[PDB]
Design a protein around this nucleic acid. Structure first.
Ligand SMILES: N[C@@H](CCC(=O)N[C@@H](CS)C(=O)NCC(=O)O)C(=O)O
Ligand SMILES: N[C@@H](CCC(=O)N[C@@H](CS)C(=O)NCC(=O)O)C(=O)O
Lengths: 236, 236
DNA sequence: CATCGTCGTTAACAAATGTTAATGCCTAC
DNA sequence: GTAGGCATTAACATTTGTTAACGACGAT
């Protein structure tokens, strides 16, 4: 965090210079037969998947310092067919071959447990996200996703809590949840304001009252408290 | 397997005990949050979370040689409040508390990479499970879970196919998906098979034609083709 | 010699959400 | 000036959440 910044210098040590991707660009696609380990240093990215007929799916987001792996370590094959798209205007990432990495992770066990940490922090995120999205309908999905964006991308302002995501398409939010229509999200989104909770001013969302989202997505909120204390501690 | 069981008695070299867990008991729980690493070597176990309204859901079934974490290795804190209840009559699980394991993997990297890889398989599993459940809702959710049971717990008669598990009852199969009402499951299962996409005869679940299940849970099928490809090969 | 439970099925009604369409506003170009 | 992206709302089809009745089956 820390841990990440030292990992960056460890990468620059082994002669791995960073590459600067711009918005809309794909760092890797669900068709590229080569697999990478990807150290996202700064910037915001999303992980998509496109069905045979074009029906896409926004799996989750990646922000700041984190690692995304397109392939297994020992076999160096593929773990799945997904795309890593850049949401931020400009994001820095270190692109390494899987063929190395385990060479680079044999090594010195400080950065070796680091990558492991991230991977252990992912299985926890996916579980909690899979929890709450299912126990309640596509409403529960929305509040859950919003709760995520609220903590990491949120900024405390006197009018409420604004998402710093500039911009945030409404067709995009449906993608992140299960909803596949711009209309159906809007049906829910001023069914999301309300009884109590958000607001959409000038052209960005503003969170006023978090517990309504909290009680609809309890495990993600509990996940944050556990795996991400600081980012959780900022708004409680 | 062959890469799991040489890691096996690296555990009781270093002296870690083979523990016997029978049906019903929980290798860890929600309300007495203790933090282990757990090497399941044989048996079938499920991962359950219970909310305060009393609604439960099955996040996943762990079976055979696999690893389950209830704690991070660096902070040694909890990853989330969950219960590892064992579906199986049998079970031999290896309990490794967290402060232990951290450099029982510093150890020697050859068995770390095994543990690392299991997590990689987990992440890609959760994502694929998340993709297929979300896009096509509950009907998709069921077809997904069915295809999972169809593969990993698979049987072949002149049947068509079959899931080895008994004590697979529709209120629990519903729990694996989002459904909390036994009748809502029957509605689907009954409907699902004037499509004749299984038989329920002999009080167990006899599917048909994987292609119907495959078409509704594509990412899950794909996952079995990229990870655990051997298991994908028996049922084609 | 069985029964009291389960558990699966079906129907019927409240609710959510999938789907297509019509609208008026926009910045991109 | 467009032409298209996006937000919003309406009206309707389908899916589901929910409860309950009925009835079969099997631990016991
Ligand atoms: N750098 C932060 C955030 C890393 C990160 O992007 N985590 C993912 C989950 S592994 C996340 O929070 N995604 C937010 C989302 O899905 O929108 C950290 O180390 O925890
Ligand atoms: N040990 C077996 C199975 C391990 C296992 O159970 N993996 C999980 C995915 S992380 C799974 O298949 N779950 C199936 C389910 O949830 O029913 C293997 O790896 O081939």
């Amino acid at each position: 965090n820390a841990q990440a910044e030292e990992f960056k210098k460890y990468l620059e040590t082994n002669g791995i210079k960073p590459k600067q991707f711009h918005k809309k660009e794909l760092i890797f696609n669900q068709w590229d037969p080569q697999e990478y380990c990807i150290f996202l240093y700064d910037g915001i990215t999303k992980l998509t998947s496109i069905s045979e007929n074009g029906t896409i799916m926004n799996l989750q987001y990646y922000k700041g310092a984190f690692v995304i792996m397109s392939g297994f370590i020992d076999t160096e094959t593929s773990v799945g067919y997904y795309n890593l798209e850049v949401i931020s205007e400009q994001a820095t990432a270190y692109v390494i071959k899987i063929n190395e990495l385990k060479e680079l992770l044999s090594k010195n066990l400080t950065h070796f447990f680091y990558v492991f940490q991230t991977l252990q922090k992912q299985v926890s995120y996916s579980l909690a996200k899979f929890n709450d999205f299912s126990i309640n309908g596509k409403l529960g999905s929305i509040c859950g996703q919003l709760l995520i964006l609220t903590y990491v991308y949120g900024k405390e302002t006197p009018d409420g809590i604004k998402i710093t995501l500039d911009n945030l398409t409404m067709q995009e939010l449906g993608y992140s949840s299960g909803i596949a229509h711009s209309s159906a999200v809007s049906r829910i989104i001023s069914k999301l304001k309300q009884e109590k909770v958000i607001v959409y001013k000038n052209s960005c969302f503003y969170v006023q009252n978090l517990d309504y989202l909290k009680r609809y997505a309890p495990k993600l909120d509990e996940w944050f408290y556990l795996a991400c204390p600081a980012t959780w501690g900022k708004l409680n």
